[PDB]
Motif scaffolding. Structure first.
Motif, PDB file in Angstrom:
ATOM      1  N   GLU A  29       0.806  -1.218   0.000  1.00 19.11           N
ATOM      2  CA  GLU A  29       0.000   0.000   0.000  1.00 19.11           C
ATOM      3  C   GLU A  29       0.845   1.276   0.000  1.00 19.11           C
ATOM      4  OE1 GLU A  29      -4.309  -1.311   2.006  1.00 19.11           O
ATOM      5  OE2 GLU A  29      -2.841  -0.145   3.150  1.00 19.11           O
ATOM      6  N   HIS A  63      -1.118 -11.512   4.436  1.00 12.06           N
ATOM      7  CA  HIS A  63      -1.945 -10.318   4.570  1.00 12.06           C
ATOM      8  C   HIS A  63      -2.282 -10.187   6.040  1.00 12.06           C
ATOM      9  CE1 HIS A  63      -5.409  -7.744   4.811  1.00 12.06           C
ATOM     10  NE2 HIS A  63      -5.429  -7.537   3.507  1.00 12.06           N
ATOM     11  N   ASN A  64      -1.804  -9.125   6.677  1.00 19.26           N
ATOM     12  CA  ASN A  64      -2.116  -8.876   8.083  1.00 19.26           C
ATOM     13  C   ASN A  64      -1.771 -10.037   9.017  1.00 19.26           C
ATOM     14  OD1 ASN A  64      -3.180  -6.694   9.755  1.00 19.26           O
ATOM     15  ND2 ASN A  64      -4.817  -8.138  10.293  1.00 19.26           N
ATOM     16  N   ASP A  67      -4.348 -13.290   8.198  1.00 22.71           N
ATOM     17  CA  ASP A  67      -5.276 -13.333   7.063  1.00 22.71           C
ATOM     18  C   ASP A  67      -4.605 -13.662   5.725  1.00 22.71           C
ATOM     19  OD1 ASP A  67      -6.673 -12.273   9.233  1.00 22.71           O
ATOM     20  OD2 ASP A  67      -8.036 -11.142   7.937  1.00 22.71           O
ATOM     21  N   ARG A  70      -6.205 -11.582  -0.863  1.00 25.32           N
ATOM     22  CA  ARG A  70      -7.151 -11.937  -1.905  1.00 25.32           C
ATOM     23  C   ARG A  70      -6.377 -12.316  -3.155  1.00 25.32           C
ATOM     24  NH1 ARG A  70     -12.940  -9.489  -3.177  1.00 25.32           N
ATOM     25  NH2 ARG A  70     -13.049  -9.823  -5.449  1.00 25.32           N
TER      26      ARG A  70
ATOM     27  N   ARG C  37      -8.376  -5.018  30.938  1.00 27.09           N
ATOM     28  CA  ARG C  37      -9.029  -4.492  29.739  1.00 27.09           C
ATOM     29  C   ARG C  37      -8.686  -3.033  29.437  1.00 27.09           C
ATOM     30  NH1 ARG C  37     -15.119  -5.581  30.404  1.00 27.09           N
ATOM     31  NH2 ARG C  37     -15.272  -3.862  28.887  1.00 27.09           N
ATOM     32  N   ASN C  38      -8.272  -2.293  30.456  1.00 27.40           N
ATOM     33  CA  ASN C  38      -7.756  -0.945  30.250  1.00 27.40           C
ATOM     34  C   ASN C  38      -6.267  -0.912  29.895  1.00 27.40           C
ATOM     35  OD1 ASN C  38      -9.789  -0.309  33.084  1.00 27.40           O
ATOM     36  ND2 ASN C  38     -10.381   0.017  30.940  1.00 27.40           N
TER      37      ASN C  38
ATOM     38  N   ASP D  22     -14.787  -8.857  25.446  1.00 25.25           N
ATOM     39  CA  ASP D  22     -13.613  -8.738  26.317  1.00 25.25           C
ATOM     40  C   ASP D  22     -12.999 -10.125  26.499  1.00 25.25           C
ATOM     41  OD1 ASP D  22     -11.776  -7.199  27.834  1.00 25.25           O
ATOM     42  OD2 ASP D  22     -12.769  -7.789  29.699  1.00 25.25           O
ATOM     43  N   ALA D  71     -13.230 -13.561   0.836  1.00 25.15           N
ATOM     44  CA  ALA D  71     -13.174 -12.361   0.011  1.00 25.15           C
ATOM     45  C   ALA D  71     -14.176 -11.359   0.518  1.00 25.15           C
ATOM     46  CB  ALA D  71     -13.481 -12.699  -1.431  1.00 25.15           C
ATOM     47  N   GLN D  74     -13.549 -10.216   4.165  1.00 28.25           N
ATOM     48  CA  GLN D  74     -12.418  -9.314   4.306  1.00 28.25           C
ATOM     49  C   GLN D  74     -12.763  -7.954   3.751  1.00 28.25           C
ATOM     50  OE1 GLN D  74      -8.650 -10.708   2.890  1.00 28.25           O
ATOM     51  NE2 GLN D  74      -8.460 -12.249   4.517  1.00 28.25           N
ATOM     52  N   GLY D  78     -12.427  -7.014   7.370  1.00 26.41           N
ATOM     53  CA  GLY D  78     -11.010  -7.208   7.621  1.00 26.41           C
ATOM     54  C   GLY D  78     -10.262  -5.900   7.684  1.00 26.41           C
ATOM     55  N   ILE D  79      -9.081  -5.924   8.300  1.00 28.90           N
ATOM     56  CA  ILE D  79      -8.215  -4.748   8.389  1.00 28.90           C
ATOM     57  C   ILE D  79      -7.501  -4.516   7.056  1.00 28.90           C
ATOM     58  CG2 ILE D  79      -6.043  -3.881   9.357  1.00 28.90           C
ATOM     59  CD1 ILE D  79      -8.443  -6.071  11.395  1.00 28.90           C
ATOM     60  N   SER D  80      -7.751  -3.364   6.441  1.00 23.48           N
ATOM     61  CA  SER D  80      -7.064  -2.975   5.207  1.00 23.48           C
ATOM     62  C   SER D  80      -7.098  -4.043   4.115  1.00 23.48           C
ATOM     63  CB  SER D  80      -5.615  -2.580   5.495  1.00 23.48           C
ATOM     64  OG  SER D  80      -4.847  -3.720   5.827  1.00 23.48           O
ATOM     65  N   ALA D  81      -8.288  -4.546   3.806  1.00 24.53           N
ATOM     66  CA  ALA D  81      -8.461  -5.523   2.735  1.00 24.53           C
ATOM     67  C   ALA D  81      -8.027  -4.939   1.399  1.00 24.53           C
ATOM     68  CB  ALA D  81      -9.897  -5.960   2.656  1.00 24.53           C
ATOM     69  N   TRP D 182     -13.230  -2.502  25.922  1.00 25.88           N
ATOM     70  CA  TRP D 182     -11.895  -2.928  26.267  1.00 25.88           C
ATOM     71  C   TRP D 182     -10.912  -2.346  25.263  1.00 25.88           C
ATOM     72  CZ3 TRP D 182     -16.249  -5.265  25.108  1.00 25.88           C
ATOM     73  CH2 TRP D 182     -16.360  -5.951  23.898  1.00 25.88           C
ATOM     74  N   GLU D 183      -9.651  -2.755  25.357  1.00 28.77           N
ATOM     75  CA  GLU D 183      -8.550  -2.047  24.708  1.00 28.77           C
ATOM     76  C   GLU D 183      -8.726  -1.843  23.202  1.00 28.77           C
ATOM     77  OE1 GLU D 183      -4.352  -3.417  26.483  1.00 28.77           O
ATOM     78  OE2 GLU D 183      -6.174  -3.805  27.638  1.00 28.77           O
ATOM     79  N   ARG D 191     -12.406  -8.726  13.992  1.00 24.61           N
ATOM     80  CA  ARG D 191     -11.719 -10.002  13.855  1.00 24.61           C
ATOM     81  C   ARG D 191     -12.708 -11.124  14.092  1.00 24.61           C
ATOM     82  NH1 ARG D 191      -8.194 -10.207  10.740  1.00 24.61           N
ATOM     83  NH2 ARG D 191      -7.423 -12.164  11.670  1.00 24.61           N
ATOM     84  N   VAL D 194     -15.059 -11.203  10.952  1.00 22.49           N
ATOM     85  CA  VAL D 194     -14.465 -11.594   9.682  1.00 22.49           C
ATOM     86  C   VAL D 194     -14.294 -13.110   9.616  1.00 22.49           C
ATOM     87  CG1 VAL D 194     -12.038 -11.406  10.311  1.00 22.49           C
ATOM     88  CG2 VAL D 194     -12.734 -10.981   7.962  1.00 22.49           C
TER      89      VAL D 194
END
Lengths: 99, 50, 98, 292, 26, 49, 50
Positions: A29, A63-64, A67, A70, C37-38, D22, D71, D74, D78-81, D182-183, D191, D194
C-alpha cells in the motif's frame, strides 16, 4: 518488453507474439502522505483466455499476519498426494474416503 | 507444435533407470514430528521440492 | 538488611537437600500475568474464579511482563508535505466575519 | 452435499455466529445489548434503495479455487483488505448462478470447478439463488452500477440503532453509540466477525421463502446488526473513549452517517474507496433481500 | 589455590529501533 | 551386454517448479529449525521462500 | 532522598516506546518441553533473565 498498438495490428499471421502481464497482488500500500495522483494509469491489451495455467502457487506472503491475501493460491492437493502403486505397477492417487 | 512433438519424442525414448543415490536415515528424534510422519525411514539427500 | 535479596545459596546441601537459610525466588518474579481491559499489568488469577490483582497494586517485584510494541519502526515513512497557496490579492482578503 | 434445513443452514451448530466480549464468547445479541445511543439534532430518513442492476458479471472460467467467503468477509470486516473489486472471484460466483454448473460452494467457503466429492458443499439450487444476487458484487466498481455510498447508510443506522417505532416510521435521529469497552474492542470485534461463515447467512437469505424466511429474519436479526455495526465503525466520522468512573466507554459518532473517511486509524478498520463501493453495493443487495 | 568471589549483573542491550526497508505483509 | 538403459541417480523430472520472488517482502522473525529437518525440508523452504 | 526524587523524575519523563527487536521462532522439536511450554512461538534473541 513493450508493444505498440500498431504492432498488435500489423504482425504476420503466423508469428508468435510475446505479451507480458503483471500480477500486482504483491504491491504494498501507498504511504499515507504520498502525494495524490491526478493522472490515470490506463491499459489496452488483455488476454482472451486464462493465462497462468501453469500457476501452482501465488502470493506467498501474509496479509495482516494471519489473514490470506485476496487472489493467493494454495497448491493443489494432487501435487502433494504420494499415492501408491496399482497391482500392475501404475501410479495412483490415495483413495478418497472409503472404500 | 514441433516442440510438443519433440517433447513427445524425448519421452518416448527416455531409457532412464533409477539407482538409489546417497541416502540418509535421520534418527527421528532429530526430526520435527510433522516431518517425521512424512518421512519413511530413509530418503535421498537430494530430497527435491514438494 | 537484604531487603533486596531475591535468591540465596544457589548450591546443593548434600546433593538433594536444601541448605538452611537458602531462598527461592518469590513466585511473583515468575508470574507473567496478562493485561487488564484498560491495559494495566496483572498477576495471574489465583485459584478460581477471582480476577488477577494488578501488579502495581501490591509491593512484590515481577520480572515477567507483557509489553506492547510496534511491530516495526513507525518513523520509517515519508514526512507529510502540503501545497500552500497564498491569496491572489491582499486587498480582497476578508478578515471580517470575526 | 449438505442438505439445507427447513430453517436454513444457519440453524446448524456448525454455522453459529459468535463474538468474544472482552475475550469471553457471547452471541452477537448479547453484545448489542451493551450498546446505548444519544440522539442529536440531525435526522436520518431512509429513502428507497434503487433496485440492483439485473446484469451479472460474465461467467468466465478462472484457474484455481476462489475463496469467496474470505473475500467478502475481508472486504467488509477485515483490516485494510486489498483487491476487493478484482473481477475473477465474482465471475466464478456468476458461474455458480448457472442452472446446471459443475462448480460447487464448499462449506469452507471456497468455490471448486471440480465436482470434488471429498469436500462437503451447499445444495447447488441454494447457491444458484445466492450467486444470482451476490455475483452483482462484481458490479460494485463499474461506474454504471456504483451504489449510493451515502444514503444506504441511513438504512444501516435504522436497522442497527433504530427503535421499533423508528423502524416502523422510517425516520430516526442520527445517533451517537456508546458501550463499556476494552482495549481494542472494535478491532477485536471485526476479527471476530471476519471469521464468521457469512455465506450460510447469505445463502439462507436468498434460498428460503415464506414463513421459514421470515423466521430466519427474526432469528438472525442480531447477526445482521453486528455486520452492520462493524461497517458503521468503519464509516463513523469519529470514534473516542470516554472515561466514565473507572470504566471506559467507546463512543462512535455517528451511527448511520457515512463520513467517507479513508485514512487508517487506530480505533477501527477503515474503508478505502474500493471498500466503500463494495460495502455500499453489498448493502444494496442485502437490504433489498432483507426487505421483501 | 585460594578461594575467590565474583559478581555479575545483567547487561543493557537497548538500542534505537532498527530501520528496515523490507516489509512483512502485502 | 547391450546398453538398453541409462542407469542414473536422483532423476530429473519432466516438470519443475519455477518461482518469481518480490525480494522486498521478508518475514522479520527468523525461524530456527533442526539441522536434520532443515536438510530434508530445506530446498523446498528456499524455493518457496 | 535526592536520588529517589531523580529516580521518580527519570521515570516520570521516560518517553521510551518499544519496537520488536531481532526475534526467533525456534522449531519447537528443538526445545525441551519445559521451555517449549514457557515459549510462545517467538521471542527476542535478547531473552533477558528470569
Amino acid at each position: 518488453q513493450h508493444v505498440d498498438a500498431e504492432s498488435i495490428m500489423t504482425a504476420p499471421k503466423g508469428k508468435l507474439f510475446h505479451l507480458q502481464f503483471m500480477d500486482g497482488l504483491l504491491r504494498p500500500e501507498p504511504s499515507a502522505f504520498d502525494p495524490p495522483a491526478s493522472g490515470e494509469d490506463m491499459r489496452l491489451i488483455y488476454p482472451l483466455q486464462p493465462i497462468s495455467v501453469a500457476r501452482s502457487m501465488r502470493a506467498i506472503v501474509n496479509h495482516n499476519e494471519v489473514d490470506r491475501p485476496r487472489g493467493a493460491v494454495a497448491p493443489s492437493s494432487y501435487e502433494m498426494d504420494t499415492g501408491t502403486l496399482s497391482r500392475n505397477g501404475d501410479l495412483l492417487y490415495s483413495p478418497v474416503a472409503n472404500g | 507444435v514441433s516442440g510438443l512433438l519433440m517433447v513427445l519424442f524425448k519421452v518416448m525414448t527416455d531409457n532412464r533407470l533409477v539407482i538409489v543415490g546417497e541416502t540418509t536415515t535421520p534418527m527421528s528424534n532429530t526430526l520435527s514430528t510433522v516431518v517425521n510422519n512424512v518421512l519413511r525411514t530413509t530418503y535421498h539427500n537430494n530430497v527435491g521440492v514438494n | 538488611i537484604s531487603v533486596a535479596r531475591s535468591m540465596r545459596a544457589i548450591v546443593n546441601h548434600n546433593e538433594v537437600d536444601r541448605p538452611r537459610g537458602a531462598v527461592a525466588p518469590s513466585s511473583y518474579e515468575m508470574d507473567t500475568g496478562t493485561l487488564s481491559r484498560n491495559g494495566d499489568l496483572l498477576y495471574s488469577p489465583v485459584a478460581n474464579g477471582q480476577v488477577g490483582i494488578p501488579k502495581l497494586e501490591v509491593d512484590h517485584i515481577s520480572f515477567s511482563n507483557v509489553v506492547s510494541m510496534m511491530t516495526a519502526n513507525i518513523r520509517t515513512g515519508d514526512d507529510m508535505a502540503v501545497e500552500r497557496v497564498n491569496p491572489d490579492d491582499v486587498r480582497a482578503i476578508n478578515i471580517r466575519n470575526a | 452435499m449438505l442438505q439445507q434445513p427447513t430453517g436454513g443452514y444457519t440453524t446448524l451448530e456448525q454455522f453459529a455466529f459468535t463474538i468474544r466480549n472482552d475475550g469471553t464468547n457471547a452471541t452477537p445479541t448479547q453484545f448489542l445489548q451493551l450498546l446505548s445511543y444519544e440522539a442529536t439534532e440531525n435526522e436520518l430518513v431512509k429513502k428507497t434503495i434503487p433496485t440492483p442492476e439485473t446484469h451479472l458479471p460474465s461467467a468466465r472460467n478462472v484457474p484455481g479455487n476462489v475463496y469467496i467467503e474470505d473475500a467478502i468477509t475481508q472486504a467488509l470486516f477485515g483490516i485494510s483488505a486489498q483487491n476487493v473489486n478484482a473481477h475473477g472471484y465474482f465471475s466464478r460466483l456468476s458461474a455458480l448462478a448457472l442452472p446446471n454448473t459443475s462448480a460447487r460452494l464448499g462449506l469452507d467457503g471456497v468455490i471448486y470447478n471440480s465436482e470434488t466429492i471429498n469436500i462437503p458443499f451447499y445444495d447447488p439450487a441454494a447457491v444458484a439463488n445466492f450467486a444470482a444476487t451476490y455475483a452483482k458484487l462484481g458490479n460494485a466498481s463499474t461506474p454504471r452500477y456504483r451504489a449510493d455510498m451515502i444514503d444506504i447508510y441511513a438504512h444501516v443506522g435504522l436497522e442497527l440503532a433504530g427503535t421499533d417505532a423508528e423502524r416502523a416510521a422510517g425516520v430516526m435521529p442520527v445517533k451517537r453509540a456508546k458501550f463499556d469497552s476494552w482495549e481494542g474492542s472494535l478491532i477485536s470485534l471485526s476479527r471476530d466477525v471476519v471469521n464468521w461463515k457469512i455465506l450460510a447467512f447469505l445463502i439462507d437469505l436468498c434460498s428460503l421463502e415464506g414463513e421459514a424466511l421470515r423466521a430466519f429474519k427474526t432469528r438472525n436479526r442480531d447477526v445482521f446488526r453486528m455486520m452492520l455495526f462493524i461497517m458503521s465503525t468503519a464509516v463513523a466520522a469519529n470514534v473516542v473513549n470516554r472515561k466514565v468512573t473507572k470504566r471506559v466507554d467507546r463512543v462512535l459518532e455517528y451511527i448511520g452517517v457515512n463520513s467517507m473517511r479513508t485514512a487508517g486509524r487506530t480505533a477501527t478498520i477503515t474503508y478505502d474507496l474500493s471498500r466503500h463501493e463494495f460495502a455500499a453495493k453489498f448493502l444494496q443487495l442485502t437490504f433489498t433481500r432483507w426487505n421483501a | 589455590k585460594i578461594a575467590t568471589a565474583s559478581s555479575a549483573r545483567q547487561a543493557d542491550v537497548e538500542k534505537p529501533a532498527d530501520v528496515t526497508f523490507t516489509i512483512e505483509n502485502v | 551386454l547391450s546398453d538398453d538403459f541409462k542407469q542414473i541417480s536422483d532423476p530429473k523430472g519432466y516438470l519443475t517448479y519455477s518461482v518469481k520472488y518480490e525480494d522486498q517482502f521478508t518475514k522479520k522473525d527468523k525461524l530456527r529449525a533442526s539441522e536434520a529437518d532443515d536438510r530434508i525440508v530445506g530446498p523446498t523452504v528456499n524455493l518457496f521462500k
